[PDB]
Symmetry: D2
């Protein structure tokens, strides 16, 4: 298990090939745009060594101690342990960090347990898993193709190499060219180029699955406009520390060593990789715990805002808070059933129930925009009446302590709270979180179509056919 | 455990004091408006003796066999058993029967287990429970006051005796006068006059809880417009058999024997009766199983309609069906967590988790109108293109078999299916189900306000206060 | 202009070929299922002769007086006159009659004014218009194909003649075979078999437009389950008089005289018929006036229910009523702009603005379900606490007058009001109205796709391109 | 009519008492946070002198030329002229500037026309109007009290002088102390301290209406966190120029000259000021034109995004764009009816219809969040894949031109478009716009309650009572 210091030194020594506003980022650990999130990830690693949480965040195996997200669960009790680790980490950042490495460790863990799925590349998968686990490395991933012409398949874009495709194969590995649309949290040692959108037949050239060090020659991470509001924790409680960053990933004829290839030219293997291995189940397990943590944060802020300005006496405000409570319980329920109904898949890997997890990941994207709206409706103008800590420390401070106090709440505490509520909803950082919740697991339109097609609807149709027998009997 | 024949004979011998369109109903077992639901309840009782289900629907105790809804659960396994019985009964009628007796047996069972709550009337409660259980009697209940002037409390209506109040107390019992707004499924042996809406202080005269035989002199059940469409199972698949009926309950100076009094003149005892005894938890447990069954029925019909007319090839139709699947899984999740997180209350009675059940009963009333809308959007004009079995048996039958066939679906089967979908949504029977789901457990406005006030919001507020410490530290 | 007596005698003398539950309807003017709506239509015709409304409902021309819906408008003032007639008729039935003949007269009027559109069949159209106008006949229409396999076009159904197609052409006319899915209000003298869903190319055999007397040999109207609750105006205020009925229309090798053919074998002419002639504009004009009347009815009932039970003192109830007011004003606005922005089409016919009307007909289907929901949320249990006038006239009458009174509202008036609210929302009649509003003008999915494709989006895209010039200038 | 240069010189010479992060802003025309919006307002003033728009934006009167927003309309034609000026100005900034001065000029214009309303202060009002008009000054306003304890009235806060109240009256004027919660666009010469939230009786001390130069001693504007993303028009197309800023307004014993007092100690006069004068009608007229412009901007961007990435071929995307079209038409309809149904008020001032305007201002706050959501659903990940113009100008430029091109759309144009869509929805600037639309005209909860209480619901209730006469007749 890594310490924060080890993670920081690794990024400083071998930084990912990041670019920000036309310039290469030489040291993300000190760069104004990245130092905050780096410090945050470091804190997650340090927590693994805190006496109070060591048993929750790590497990011992043959003299070594590994992060819980690497544990291949054999019992429901093991699943619960993984869930508690997901939750503890999520709580540290109010569920605002959506791409912490444990999400991808769940994927790799499942891939390894179900390694036979990958055939000749099975050992590569098992070895890669052990590598990430032993070194406790941080990962990032990019699964979607560039949004160019969505009316056409990967092979029908303006260029054959817009999506990541194989240029050639050599004795050392494969050379790839193209790009992936989005990679969140590029402050990692490794990047996973795994499957994502159901590949249409005839996409062999793009049917790939591999992993590479983020410093690989030819690999570039082009970062989008930064959303770090500033470094003041008072003024920017969340964006100053949890801005994970999103980036376009470019592959300029990058060489991928054979040992890092997991899938090559197999459309079907790519399309069923997450489902067959159980990676989908485990990554969705991290997600449900994460969204439960996120909803708990919104509930706390909503309750404090309402109490703070005396709006809690109004029935409709109480109802809005109760709505968040209902959603919180819904997510807790999905989480509980996902673990309780867990069963082993074809490779003997225990996986949390897909019915419950598909429910959770397809419902939350609909609930989040409403939870966000609720905070807006409760806070109203208080959400934009945001003087800075500098204003409180300035000449008008005394006036602000009088006009911005709440009901039995001092002004500084009030503004600190509303600055947080604002950062969770209306700052560039907060607003991005909404788009993220709507799309990170996929496009709802296609996710729902996928659920329709994979779900076993037969039992229900059969019960209706049985019920209708009495109807058709009138013709006998 | 009662047989259907015993239930039918009991109603025939001592029928409830029902009134329909100005006339007394002498025999509900043969009356056109009630014979259907009576036959349906009888079938539920008969199922308890079917070899295939006897172990699911009943339990043995000291030489006797009782209905599962009377079982005082001591373990989570016992809770699961109660849940399976709720579900099996619910499935028989596609979750369309909302007031089957097991819902109220759950209430009485909890009242009995937590009998100490009722003080001097504790033995009355325990004895009443044993009575209902031993005779396996059917019950109905009326908890709300007449909707007259909602701007005023029970003691501020046009008359002091509009709501049910105590006129006087004698050596034999109490005399009550007034009325209860609604009682669903009056085809029962007993009626429960228990608490409902939080009684405002100073309502001692109305703070009552008692039970009476439905044939009690002075007791009247005034039934509303019947929604039985007809007796043909083809033409009216549901209304011909599951029309439970709703009625206003009048008390014309009715005498309530002391042995049937459970609460008298105690406002606080009335207000906390369901929560303290665990009746709320257990009755909500029956509800979540019931709504899961109901959602399964809608899923089956939606899938069959879409497949039947070839609408399933359209993405948005698949998405609508997937939405029902998400809601189905949400209800299953609440059900699972309610049982898994169960704990004993103050009286030692194991009760399903209130967090999960409050989530389920406050979310479903919002989901149901949408599930209903989905069926409407899928079926479109097919939902009103409803010829009768008589049309198929008539001269134009051959034409109908050609014009109303579906995709690989014969016309008679198609119409039988759409007649069912229509009866579940647009017939008077179907539309009532929507209003029922929106309000049976209470007014959402007040249910949400109640949830806000009872829920422990402190842990979440505390986590936010802890997170904000760093914000306030900038002033040190 | 026809009188009610003339309409009644016409239906009695030459009744439409209606079928109800396997039997031919010999006299719809006395049949229990149809006499109510017949009486209602008759009343609309009689209103044309009422001194108070003669100037609003009719116009004089060359010694004759015709119904306003036949007026070919030459000025905006004329458009306003047509609108006032639509509104006055709509108000008589609280906007619950959706297929009153003036809707189709608007279509025929536009077809006639733009008769050149039909080429060689132009005179047939002009003559047919004069016929309907002079005799002031009632019409019904059926535009959609049988819902069999929606995954395939009209020519790809289980049989080539499921949709109405031409079997052969003779010296006397064309012989057609097939069926139309739905025709509402079949209590008419004539049936219009006009285009509806955009016909896919290669559907020449189905590209038809003609009209026939409803008594034509081989023509059959198969009625669906009746929704007439009863004849008591107290018990069934709306269904006893406004149940228009829906039916499947069968064509058993029906002969269509050449003089009644308006379009034959021309796919493109069918697809653009409503838009090019202005029929779409005028029929949508009747619709916006109708929905304004309907919303006014719901506003009145909602306000009376809330006031009646004292629920109007609650803020959220006031907000719900205000929501209906907002929707009412939205419809009034669309109506006003539709008339004020009217311009002449390619044939010189003044047509109300399509932008405003497309807005109204695509927005109301979304607003209506909410308006209906609002009534449900306001009335709650009062909507199913529906004793009959027979109960008030019976032994328990005195009790009902006490328990069902409202706030300063007598019991009989209260129940009459709630019986109406119920009939507008939850009776079979009321629930059907919801499905009707969602689909009568077409499937929202396709209506919205149609709006996207016909709307001129260029001005807005051009303004954005102009705004972005400054953005691209940074590269100069 | 002012020129941009004159406005800039005025702010430079006598700047408003603005504060940003603890420091006084000495020159808002050059300050990084304010120079953008100042330049934008200046451009609006300069447009008044453009030959192409002079006739639209100004009118001549007795040798002078004034801004159209000052025109006291005498005819509907005059109302139309005011509307066209509102629209032309709104279009310049895509409807993103919500507090341009013409909104408040409408208020002052109405106050002046209805000056008799103010009694002894009538001449002050008339004179103030002429002052603003003649000098064509810019105004800002603050109408709400500090959000401290919303459970109590203005006189029940932690201090009597939290809200703005009169300390004393002297021969020179009144001295006020307290604060107003929010003032948007403080880059003005004058600030209007007018009424807002219905004052509870007994608030005489707070019942005020006056205006002051923004440089008045003791007056302070405390600005919130700035949302200007940067100065690059490519990177921040909107926030670089339309960030109006919001601020808390402090009154440290400010002296208000008697000539600038319009209402003093009159609760009722304050509560009915906007309605009685017609200010509400005219300010809402500017708003409907503004929101129409805003919706046109969103329609253009949505259409361009969809076309740009080839998403327009998908039905659901077309439907989403059509939804925006429906909302656009709804706003156009409200605007048209507001002008067409205009009538003179009690003071002879022609005012646009309140029914239509109340519909528009209570509906748009519900429509805007959906319009914003639609852009999010169309753009998806493209909304956060935002490289900078600096990235295009850097080493990776060539790669970006390949991977970020769209369907027949070059990469630079594509990113410029998505940067705009992002700035309109997800940047701090964009997200604030959502909160602004939800609340600028007031709290929807109270706005809807206000509409319920002011609307004449009698005609509709009367029509229902008339319809129910037939129901009650069954008892005769
Ligand atoms: C904040 C954020 C963070 C993210 N983080 C990551 C990450 O860390 N790693 C990663 O791999 N991905 C990440 N993503 C990408 C995310 O998974 C995608 O946005 C999502 O899968 C949708 O794909 P898209 O963005 O290409 O949508 P697009 O399809 O490009 O968007 C336009 C679409 O048009 C419609 N459409 C397009 N094609 C079809 C079709 N075939 N059928 C029907 N409708 C269609 C869709 O409804 C949608 O409106 C992130 C996204 C966001 C917004
Ligand atoms: C089909 C159906 C079946 C039912 N079956 C049963 C049954 O079997 N047994 C039984 O006991 N009950 C039954 N009920 C009654 C049901 O529990 C009630 O409808 C529900 O509790 C709401 O009470 P109400 O109907 O009196 O609502 P009301 O309050 O009478 O309705 C008007 C209300 O105005 C508002 N309002 C009123 N008072 C307040 C307030 N104090 N604060 C805020 N808002 C307020 C509410 O939002 C609602 O709009 C049934 C109801 C229905 C519709």
């Amino acid at each position: 298990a890594r310490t924060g210091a080890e993670y920081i030194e690794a990024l400083k020594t071998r930084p990912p090939n990041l670019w920000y506003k036309g310039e290469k980022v030489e040291d993300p650990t000190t760069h104004p745009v990245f130092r905050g999130i780096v410090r945050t990830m470091a804190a997650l690693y340090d927590l693994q060594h805190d006496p109070r949480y060591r048993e929750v965040l790590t497990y011992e195996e043959e003299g070594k101690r590994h992060g819980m997200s690497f544990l291949i669960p054999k019992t429901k009790e093991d699943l619960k342990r993984r869930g508690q680790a997901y939750k503890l980490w999520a709580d540290q950042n109010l569920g605002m960090m959506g791409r912490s490495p444990d999400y991808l460790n769940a994927v790799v863990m499942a891939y390894a347990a179900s390694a036979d799925y990958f055939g000749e590349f099975a050992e590569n998968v098992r070895n890669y898993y052990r590598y990430l686990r032993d070194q406790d490395l941080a990962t990032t991933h990019a699964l979607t193709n560039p949004q160019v012409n969505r009316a056409r398949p990967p092979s029908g874009q303006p260029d054959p190499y817009i999506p990541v495709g194989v240029v050639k194969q050599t004795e050392k590995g494969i050379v790839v060219r193209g790009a992936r649309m989005t990679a969140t949290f590029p402050l990692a040692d490794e990047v996973l180029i795994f499957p994502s959108i159901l590949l249409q037949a005839g996409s062999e050239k793009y049917a790939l699955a591999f992993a590479l060090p983020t410093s690989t020659p030819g690999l570039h991470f082009v970062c989008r406009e930064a959303l770090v509001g500033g470094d003041s924790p008072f003024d920017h409680p969340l964006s100053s520390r949890v801005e994970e960053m999103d980036c376009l990933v470019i592959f300029d004829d990058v060489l991928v060593p054979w040992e890092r290839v997991f899938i090559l030219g197999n459309v079907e293997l790519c399309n069923n990789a997450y489902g067959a291995t159980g990676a989908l189940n485990h990554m969705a397990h991290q997600v449900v715990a994460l969204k439960t943590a996120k909803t708990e944060a919104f509930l706390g802020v909503a309750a404090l805002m309402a109490e703070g300005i005396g709006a809690d006496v109004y029935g409709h405000v109480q109802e809005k808070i109760a709505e968040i409570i209902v959603y919180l319980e819904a997510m807790r329920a999905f989480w509980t059933r996902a673990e309780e109904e867990a069963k082993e898949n074809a490779y003997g890997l225990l996986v949390p129930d897909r019915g419950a997890l598909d429910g959770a990941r397809n419902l939350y994207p609909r609930l989040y925009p409403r939870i966000r709206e609720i905070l807006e409706q409760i806070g109203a103008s208080g959400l934009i009446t945001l003087p800075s800590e500098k204003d409180f420390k300035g000449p008008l401070g005394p006036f602000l302590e009088k006009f911005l106090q709440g009901a039995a709440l001092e002004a500084k505490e009030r503004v600190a709270l509303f600055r947080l509520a604002w950062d969770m909803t209306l700052s560039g950082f907060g607003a991005r979180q909404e788009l993220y919740e709507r799309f990170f697991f996929g496009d709802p339109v296609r996710m729902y179509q996928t659920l329709y097609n994979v779900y076993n609807k037969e039992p229900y149709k059969e019960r209706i056919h049985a019920f209708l027998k009495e109807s058709l009997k009138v013709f006998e």
